[PDB]
Amino acid sequence: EKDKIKFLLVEGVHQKALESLRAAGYTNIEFHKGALDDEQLKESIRDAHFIGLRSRTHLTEDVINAAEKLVAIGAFAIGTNQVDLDAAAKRGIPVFNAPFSNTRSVAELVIGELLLLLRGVPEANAKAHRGVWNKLAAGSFEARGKKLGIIGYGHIGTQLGILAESLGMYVYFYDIENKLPLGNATQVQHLSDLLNMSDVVSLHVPENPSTKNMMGAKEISLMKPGSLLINASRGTVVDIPALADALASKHLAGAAIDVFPTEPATNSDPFTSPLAEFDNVLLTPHIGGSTQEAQENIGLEVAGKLIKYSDNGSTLSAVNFPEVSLPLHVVRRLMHIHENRPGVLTALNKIFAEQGVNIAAQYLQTSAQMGYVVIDIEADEDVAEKALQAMKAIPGTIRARLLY
Amino acid sequence: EKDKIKFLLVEGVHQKALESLRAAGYTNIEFHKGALDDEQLKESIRDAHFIGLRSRTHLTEDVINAAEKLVAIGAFAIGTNQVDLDAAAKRGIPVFNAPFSNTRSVAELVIGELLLLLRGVPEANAKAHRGVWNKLAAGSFEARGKKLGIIGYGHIGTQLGILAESLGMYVYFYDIENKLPLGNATQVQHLSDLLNMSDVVSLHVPENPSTKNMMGAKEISLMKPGSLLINASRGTVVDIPALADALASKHLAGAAIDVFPTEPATNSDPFTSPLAEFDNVLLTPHIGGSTQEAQENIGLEVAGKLIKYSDNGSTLSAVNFPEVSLPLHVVRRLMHIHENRPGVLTALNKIFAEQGVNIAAQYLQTSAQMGYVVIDIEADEDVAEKALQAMKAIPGTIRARLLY
Amino acid sequence: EKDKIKFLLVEGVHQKALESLRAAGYTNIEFHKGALDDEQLKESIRDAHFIGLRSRTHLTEDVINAAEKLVAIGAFAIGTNQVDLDAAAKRGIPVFNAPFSNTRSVAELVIGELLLLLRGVPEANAKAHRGVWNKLAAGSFEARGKKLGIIGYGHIGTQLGILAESLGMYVYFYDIENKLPLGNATQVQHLSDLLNMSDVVSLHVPENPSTKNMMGAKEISLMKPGSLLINASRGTVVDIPALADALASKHLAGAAIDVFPTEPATNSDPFTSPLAEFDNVLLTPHIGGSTQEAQENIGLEVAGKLIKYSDNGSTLSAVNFPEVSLPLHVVRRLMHIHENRPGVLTALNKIFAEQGVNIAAQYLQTSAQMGYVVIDIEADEDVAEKALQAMKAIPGTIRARLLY
Amino acid sequence: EKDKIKFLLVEGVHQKALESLRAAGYTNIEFHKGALDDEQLKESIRDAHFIGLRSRTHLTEDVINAAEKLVAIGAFAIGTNQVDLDAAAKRGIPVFNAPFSNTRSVAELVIGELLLLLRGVPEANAKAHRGVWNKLAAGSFEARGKKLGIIGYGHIGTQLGILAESLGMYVYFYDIENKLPLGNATQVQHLSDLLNMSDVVSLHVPENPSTKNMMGAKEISLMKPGSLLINASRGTVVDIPALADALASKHLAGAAIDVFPTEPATNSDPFTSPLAEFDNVLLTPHIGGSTQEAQENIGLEVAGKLIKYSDNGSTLSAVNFPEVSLPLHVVRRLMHIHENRPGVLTALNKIFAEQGVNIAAQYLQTSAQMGYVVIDIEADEDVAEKALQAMKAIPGTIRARLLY
Ligand SMILES: NC(=O)C1=CN([C@@H]2O[C@H](COP(=O)(O)OP(=O)(O)OC[C@H]3O[C@@H](n4cnc5c(N)ncnc54)[C@H](O)[C@@H]3O)[C@@H](O)[C@H]2O)C=CC1
Ligand SMILES: NC(=O)C1=CN([C@@H]2O[C@H](COP(=O)(O)OP(=O)(O)OC[C@H]3O[C@@H](n4cnc5c(N)ncnc54)[C@H](O)[C@@H]3O)[C@@H](O)[C@H]2O)C=CC1
Ligand SMILES: NC(=O)C1=CN([C@@H]2O[C@H](COP(=O)(O)OP(=O)(O)OC[C@H]3O[C@@H](n4cnc5c(N)ncnc54)[C@H](O)[C@@H]3O)[C@@H](O)[C@H]2O)C=CC1
Ligand SMILES: NC(=O)C1=CN([C@@H]2O[C@H](COP(=O)(O)OP(=O)(O)OC[C@H]3O[C@@H](n4cnc5c(N)ncnc54)[C@H](O)[C@@H]3O)[C@@H](O)[C@H]2O)C=CC1
């Protein structure tokens, strides 16, 4: 019956999501190359079991209400701000994403930008397109020999460090968790001392109160004069007026910014920034993530996360939902989603005790207000089909399924 | 040594060169940040033992011939077209330079350009300085997994191949001479194959009859649709209008040009190109070697060649002159430069035999119509002074002197 | 926690283990440098909550059954043949160990042996301790450029291959399962080919019907005349008399054996071998894993497994027991071990339902005839204490306890 | 006439010397596998133009006197103590050797020995061959993580450092010349501080007053307790009674020695050392050099050094002779060896001046008492054949040749 399970894919996810899905039997797929209208969406999602969307579709409480058959949501993207998770949670629908499929794409972007920034290319190039010729060597540098200071040594920070070392830089980092340095990286205990020694400082941190304006005047002023600050992390992490002044005073020699406190909503919208007045600043429209390889990594991972929720019930890594996962070890398995309150499990288990059916394995995890329980029982179809009926009738039940 | 020996240094040679000069005793130095006009050049060089210059200074027959005391010429620079080699060799003046002194600067620039060109970054940055936001993934790619086509696997081609490899690209090269690949690089027999296959092609060929318009419309169309072409070898290698067509036709995704058929004379003259209308092209004012690190190596190297030759008469690597070098062992040493014709050498030696002075070592090399010779003899100072004077008189003599 | 929980540690476990134990609150520790006789073992374990042992201590049915308070068993050691798994699982006692805790020690030993065996060094050293000087080059070789034949490309085979490679040997392997090569390693289909080609063959196979006498006279003669055979997998893998013949016949140049069919019981029992008469053989008393670094990792790892399971009931990686682990979220947690038969779980849950205590999370895994379960519930201490007592009464119950 | 030029090769040089020689036309070769008698030597060398010998033939003044046609001597070995250089110098015969063809062989030996020493293998193995079984882990270590202190950072010291780094050691060195560290090596300014930090100290220095007993009691006592000292450099550099005591007090845990203050003259002779009483000492009979690859490297290099002296007159690197070398740049070249006294060169050059023959190039280097001069002249055979006659007649001449 997989062929009767519908997958609606909007905004054109990578073709590899399709391959990895048609490899798992789910062949009933409506694919669109672009974002649907305030209204054709709803018509299309109505009998969809799985929807796959990107950063531009707004999966709002109004729209999820439209969807009578919806089972799980797959965001082929890093963010989920475009989805009402609380809406999906209430209806028993997990939402999955791809928070780390972009690593390489971002590191490689930071290497090229620091190669050309260190060389003054971005300025030479803007003058060139304006018919001005600006040769000089004064203040142009190669990267081999330079110090790179990476702030935030997680997935991307560590790939970058490695890349940079290939080019002969001395990598140095600062993270809040103590870490195990790869290669020759070197942890620095105080931020201010990372800043003083760094020819190039690159931010690779998450978004939150600890990161709101982490790089402000005070921190920028600590940077080594003549240095470059590159930020492809979060738009909230550097102070733009403060960077603008530091660029103006030539205290920095340049910058690359991929993310801004306010980003235009669409390509059609206009982009405005006080940094646009600087030739020696790379400004990109949030594309550190935007490669076909990441599109592909993302395609594979989020489709596999939907395949697994569909096949064996796993909600490992779900964003809005209790995480649960059981090793496949026995024919016959079911799941049950319910209001997290006293007595539900007991009722559930009774359906089998009271008829001599043996429970092989069970995993239950709860949220403030909901529970996911996956159970493996030694029974046959008829018995299960029946237990499923009964489970569905359990006061507090939101939904339940017979996975196999 | 002798703080009387005048060095004229012009066009802002790296300060390293002056440190080297001063560490060797030579303190008498006229330094200029830039070039000089005909009269003040001619004025500064009237009494100069050595000159150091860059590309903007033109030592012509007439110039050199009025440099009364000129002993040698150092081109702090790869090329020597600014200098009249022949004219110097006739006055017995060796010219030195710095042959391969920026292989790394160019390799590294190429790596940064292809990272950003592959990402469509140059365009997005142009557009962003104009208020336009352009967030795509559609033609963007990571460098890892891609094929780099290197045309000309020499000093620079080779060194580029290693960087590219240590970045996960597959490296293929096409060269007119069978070469032994470094790392996992692969030589391709047919230039057409390399083009069709490569995702990025970067030119590294010399300037000569066989490279002129090496990449015209034929060769460009053999390139992978959506690929990229980078050129930081020689202005003469690429049909620039071919290239503008192929770009306007979207047959190439972008390109990066460091050198052009006709380059501006100075930073005041206008830069004109068909390629300036394309946001997706990097134009740089011929800066592949314009790096402090390079200027520094050049400066060390060439002031070195001049000290070694003021001090011990070496001319290993001179560009207009017979190459000779003698290991220092036995105080004193002299040298003589003469027309290359039978009889001189015997004449020269006899000056020593007939007064019973022993000749410790000696090296003579000749060109076409000049010969050169360094001699070591065992004698106190006066005998050397006097014998020198005899050597000047030998028929054929151009120039001679006493080193220590 | 509770400085009352008795750990018995015997056969001189690494001190790291005690540091780990003490950092987690458990200070009540009886440590022994060596093994104990039947009566004092039995005396030390009568009131022991946990035991740590090595290979010389034999926990038999009778032993385990008189360990009144035994909660778990850690084999600080790769193997568990010393321990009665079944007998422990029936008393609801999980046994842990350290699966692959010395891949590196063995790889490194193999590398040092083949460097010296290839050089004929072992012989020259024997001879030199007898007054005899033997200075040859005739059958001596460097490792670089030679072929290493690895039989069994697993944890250790793999890790050896990398070391060998980073030393310039060519690495070939023969394995019964298609494996993906690391570095430039190459899988060979026919064991005979590998033998004929390889200069050094090193065995890394498990002990089982298919490896017994895996290298008898046939296979040895297929080896390269003058080659070398190293074995630090299992005593049972090599026809040792075959091997002595092939050595006396000069068909092999040497060998290195870490393990033998019959090993001495202790450092007092005699070691006998046909191979002892050959100077050109390295004999080692089964020390491929006997390194401080390894003992330390083992010690950290296994005292870890015991703390995690005293504290939160984990049994990830236990060797006789259903594997279950639950992320710590909501104070309190309990666990129950029972015969695996219908009815228990419902019985167990109902204890909570019927008094309105909410069950936060729960994990049950079962084996054959045992089931295991960890539960999180929201209740103050007294209710937990009391409910525990009820759980003990559930029919089927083997053992239960309250973790926090 | 090359086929009429005889090459006598004793002690069995590597077959590659023969290939590289028969590649250059010299095909008239008497090869022996072993060292000739006090007398068959002389019979065989009598009309030899080139002899090639190893460490065991004594090329003494008595024997060189035997040799009427001898031109150059090739020691297919590092040492030349077996040759009377002064004897050969007087007769105009250069002696060549292979001082650096052994690098890899020695480094690889030091790696294997430090692998097994760190493991206590040498002791376990000696007990094993004596029927004693000695398991322990206490004090056995892997190398990854350890500090290696290399004393003398020349050809071998640097190859070793690299090797060691592959195995994960921290390399540290001490040399008297300041050096450029490869990889992650680290120069240490004071010996005593290299010693304190080093788990393994390995000597790689030359022989001379600065090295006589460099490692004496005082220096050994500075070593980190528990460390190992490995010496495959020179027999004069460590104090053997002082090492013996330090091994006795267990201040060191072991050692490898390849060279001794007194080495037996032949395999037949007896070897005696106070270290032979130690199981935990590797003792080798000076075989750090003894591999087929070094035999081969040596074969190629010293045969090529004889080929070049024979073909173009180069004495670059000759051990007993003035070093001289001219680039091939012109048909016709001759050499002349003479007493270093006033007037010889003049006479030589006159032979050409006085007949209109032009000297293209000349290199003359002198010794305390002899001169090598190589000259290139623009003439034809007849003229040269004639000049050769005359040159031979020059008061002070020892020998002369027409190379081509
Ligand atoms: N520019 C773009 O298109 C994209 C941006 N990213 C972003 O890059 C950032 C990092 O990404 P990943 O490394 O993949 O995740 P990650 O979780 O591995 O990186 C977080 C790291 O930051 C360190 N850190 C957290 N707070 C810190 C603070 N207060 N001060 C210093 N260090 C701190 C953490 O210890 C951790 O190592 C995220 O914000 C992620 O969304 C990821 C993909 C694309
Ligand atoms: N962008 C800049 O400011 C600078 C440009 N360059 C230029 O880049 C070029 C490369 O320099 P190097 O690597 O030192 O050159 P190189 O001398 O090391 O190698 C050039 C290679 O091209 C090959 N080659 C020659 N003619 C060819 C042909 N027609 N087709 C294909 N291969 C051919 C040769 O076999 C040679 O291997 C030179 O022209 C150099 O002047 C060098 C430094 C700076
Ligand atoms: N010398 C010592 O004191 C120690 C010995 N060992 C032993 O060395 C052996 C290797 O251990 P690991 O690398 O962890 O093993 P592993 O489990 O990682 O791999 C063994 C490999 O051998 C292959 N294999 C199995 N049967 C085979 C057969 N009959 N013919 C060819 N290949 C076969 C399997 O495919 C597997 O890939 C084990 O027996 C282990 O007990 C391990 C540690 C220390
Ligand atoms: N064991 C064997 O069969 C063989 C031994 N060797 C020997 O190894 C030794 C080193 O060989 P290579 O490295 O190839 O020659 P090398 O000349 O490159 O090594 C000499 C190094 O020792 C350093 N050094 C010299 N005197 C020192 C002192 N007073 N204190 C500290 N450092 C000092 C020098 O600066 C230089 O870097 C030589 O004695 C050589 O004959 C070489 C081949 C085989």
- B:94-123 residues touching chain A, CB 8 A cutoff: 104-105, 108-109, 111-116, 119-122
Q: How far apart are CA D365 and CA B362, in angstroms?
A: 7
Q: How far apart are CA B225 and CA B251, in angstroms?
A: 5
Q: What are A37's two structure tokens?
A: 């209208």
| CA-based nearest residue to D13, from D73, D64, D68, D62 | D73
State this model's resolution in angstroms: 2.8
- The 10 Å Cβ neighbour count of residue A346 is 21
Chain C residue numbers with beta carbons less than 8 Å from the beta carbon of A342 are 352-353, 356-359
Exposure class string for A38-59: b at 16+ Cβ within 10 A, else e = eeebeebbeebbbbbbbbebeb
Please enumerate in sequence order all residues whose Cβ is within 8 A of that of D389, keeping only pairs 6 or more positions apart, or say none: none
Q: How far apart are CA B396 and CA B347, in angstroms?
A: 10
Name the region of D343 (left: φ>0; alpha: ψ -120 to 50; beta: rest): left
Nearest to B361 among D342, D353, D364 (CB): D364
- B:210-239 residues touching chain A, CB 8 A cutoff: none
* CB B303, CB B52: distance < 8 Å: yes
Does the annotation count C234 as an active-site position?
Answer: yes
Amino acid at C46: R
SS3 A254: strand
Name the region of A254 (left: φ>0; alpha: ψ -120 to 50; beta: rest): left
* CB C83, CB C111: distance < 8 Å: no
| CA-based nearest residue to B91, from B103, B102, B80, B83 | B83
Is B338 assigned to a binding site?
no
Q: How far apart are CA A56 and CA B41, in angstroms?
A: 66
Bridge-based pairing state of the strands A29-31 and D227-231: unpaired
The ligand 4 atom nearest the CA atom of D289: 3
Q: Which residue of C has its CA nearest to D139?
A: C292
- The 10 Å Cβ neighbour count of residue A176 is 11
* CB C313, CB C376: distance < 8 Å: no
Does the annotation count C144 as an active-site position?
Answer: no
Q: Is the peptide bond before C332 cis (omega within 30 degrees of 0)?
A: yes
Domain boundaries, chain C: 1-102+292-320, 103-291, 322-403
* CB C42, CB C66: distance < 8 Å: yes
| Fold (topology level) of B322-403 | Alpha-Beta Plaits (3.30.70)
Chain B residue numbers with beta carbons less than 8 Å from the beta carbon of A137 are 287, 289-292, 294-295
| Fold (topology level) of A1-102+292-320 | Rossmann fold (3.40.50)
- Of C54, C104, C234, C336, the active-site residue reads C234
Name the region of B343 (left: φ>0; alpha: ψ -120 to 50; beta: rest): left
- Identify how the structure was determined: X-ray
Chains A and C touch, using 3 or more CB pairs below 8 Å = yes
Q: Give how far Cα D226 sits from Cα of A340, B386, D143, D254, Å.
A: 63, 69, 14, 8
Burial tier of C203 (Cβ tally within 10 Å: 0-12, 13-18, 19+): buried
- The 10 Å Cβ neighbour count of residue C136 is 14
Does the annotation count C385 as an active-site position?
Answer: no
Q: How far apart are CA C145 and CA C170, in angstroms?
A: 7
CA of C86 to the centre of ligand 3 (A): 25
> In testing the pocket of ligand 4, which one of D205, D238, D286 has its CB within 8 Å of the most ligand atoms?
D205
Task: List, by residue number, the catalytic residues of B.
Answer: 234, 263, 286
CA atoms within 13 A on the CB side of C269: 7
What single DSSP character describes residue A36? P
Q: Which residue of A has its CA nearest to B272?
A: A131
Amino acid at D185: A
User: CA of C12 to nearest chain D CA: how many angstroms apart?
Assistant: 10
Hey, what's the torsion of the CAs at C179, C180, C186, C187, to 10 degrees? 20
Strand partners, C358: C378
* CB B120, CB B319: distance < 8 Å: no
CA of B45 to the centre of ligand 4 (A): 50
Q: How far apart are CA D276 and CA D122, in angstroms?
A: 12
Q: Which residue of C has its CA nearest to D141?
A: C291
* CB D305, CB D95: distance < 8 Å: no
Exposure class string for A231-241: b at 16+ Cβ within 10 A, else e = bbbbbbbbbbe
Nearest to B293 among A109, A141, A264 (CB): A141
Exposure class string for A294-320: b at 16+ Cβ within 10 A, else e = bbbbbbbbbbbbbbbbbbbbbbebbbb
Q: How far apart are CA B364 and CA D359, in angstroms?
A: 9
Tell if the CB–CB gap between D353 and B340 is shorter than 8 Å.
no
Q: Which residue is associated with the tokens 């941190």?
A: A205
- The 10 Å Cβ neighbour count of residue D81 is 11
Q: How far apart are CA A94 and CA A75, in angstroms?
A: 11
Residue D364 touches chain B, beta carbons under 8 Å: yes
Is B232 assigned to a binding site?
yes
Q: How far apart are CA D161 and CA D111, in angstroms?
A: 10
Please enumerate in sequence order all residues whose Cβ is within 8 A of that of D79, keeping only pairs 6 or more positions apart, or say none: D55, D97
Q: Which residue is associated with the tokens 């520790």?
A: C29
Q: How far apart are CA B274 and CA B294, in angstroms?
A: 31
Question: How big is the CA angle at A240 (ends A236 and A245), to the nearest 5 degrees?
Answer: 155
SS3 A13: coil
Note the CATH architecture for domain B103-291.
Answer: 3-Layer(aba) Sandwich (3.40)
| CA-based nearest residue to B313, from B341, B289, B336, B286 | B336
CA atoms within 13 A on the CB side of C292: 14
SS3 C155: helix
